[PDB]
Amino acid sequence: IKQGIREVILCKDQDGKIGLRLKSIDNGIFVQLVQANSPASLVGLRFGDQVLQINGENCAGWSSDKAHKVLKQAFGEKITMTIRDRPFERTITMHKDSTGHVGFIFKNGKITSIVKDSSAARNGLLTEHNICEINGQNVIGLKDSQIADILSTSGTVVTITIMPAFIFEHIIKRMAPSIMKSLMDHTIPEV
């Protein structure tokens, strides 16, 4: 999680699309969905990023509908956004034990227990936290089995980005786990 604000400049694609769904949370505006192969993924927008401004207008107090409307009426050539990096999330670095375990159980992406004497215990991994990202890869909406696969295939050093479950549940409200699995960008970013 970067320690502050950044400018991103977007162009609408062929189809007039940027590849975002935004959600009003606590009078801010947050990234709910980043579509694979979109302008939003190419410029590096992430699930949970806060949108401070759009074209130098403050988003504070906007409905999810008004943010979507402002974006639909922007001269798509150049759209500026001021972004605060994933403010609800934290990153935890863990090390697999020789059995390949970091040391937790999770269900529907939510950590439910920490195994005694594990890297997860030593590193203060918390329960009631949704997994947002593993080693920089968005995993939101993947089956638990695909998440376990990713942790299997990772090197010994595992980075996990988590979010308090109450906040996670507030953001993904009104995005059933088809688009979440289907259309949430799960790729490694392009260079």
What are the structural domains of the chain?
Answer: 5-84 (2.30.42.10), 90-183 (2.30.42.10)
C-alpha distance from residue 68 to each of 20, 59, 155, 178 (Å):
9, 11, 39, 21
- The tokens for 39 are 């302008």
* Contact (CB, 8 A) for 144 and 150: no
Name the strand (E) or helix (H) holding 74: none
**Resolution reached, in Å?**
1.8
Torsion angle, CA of 191/34/169/173, rounded to 10 degrees? 180
Enter the DSSP assignment of 190: P
Give the integer Cα–Cα distance in Å for 97 and 115.
Answer: 12
* Token couple for 69: 């409307």
Among 87, 86, 94, smallest CA distance to 111 is for 94
Q: H or E element: which one contains 36?
A: none
Element (H, E) at 187: none
* H or E element in which residue 57 lies: strand 57-58
Q: Work out the burial of residue 78: count CB atoms within 10 Å of its CB; fewer than 13 is exposed, 13-18 middle, 19 or more buried.
A: exposed
Reference 32, options 77, 58, 6, 68; nearest CA is 68
- 108 among the known binding-site residues? yes
Tell me the DSSP string of 127-173: SSEEEEEETTEE-TT--HHHHHHHHHHS-SEEEEEEEEHHHHHHHST
Q: What dihedral angle (degrees, nearest 10) is formed by the CA atoms of 127, 129, 133, 135?
A: -30
- Rounded to whole angstroms, the Cα distance separating 116 from 104 reads 9
Q: What are phi and psi of 170, to 5 degrees?
A: -70, -35
What is residue 26's three-state secondary structure?
Answer: coil
Burial of 28 (0-12, 13-18, 19+ CB in 10 A): middle
User: What span, in angstroms and rounded, lies between the C-alpha atoms of 35 and 138?
Assistant: 11
How far is Cα of residue 26 from the mean position of the Cα atoms in its chain? 17
CA distance 78 to 60: 22
Amino acid at 71: L
Query: In the numeric block, which tokens belong to residue 55?
Result: 């074209």
Which residue has tokens 């949108």?
Answer: 51
Cα atoms in the Cβ-side hemisphere of radius 13 Å centred on 78: 4
Give the sign of the dihedral formed by CA 182, CA 43, CA 10, CA 60: positive
143 among the known binding-site residues?
Answer: yes
Let me know the angle formed at the C-alpha of 31 by 25 and 32, rounded to the nearest 5 degrees.
85
User: What is the spatial distance between Cα 45 and Cα 84, in angstroms, rounded to a whole number?
Assistant: 10
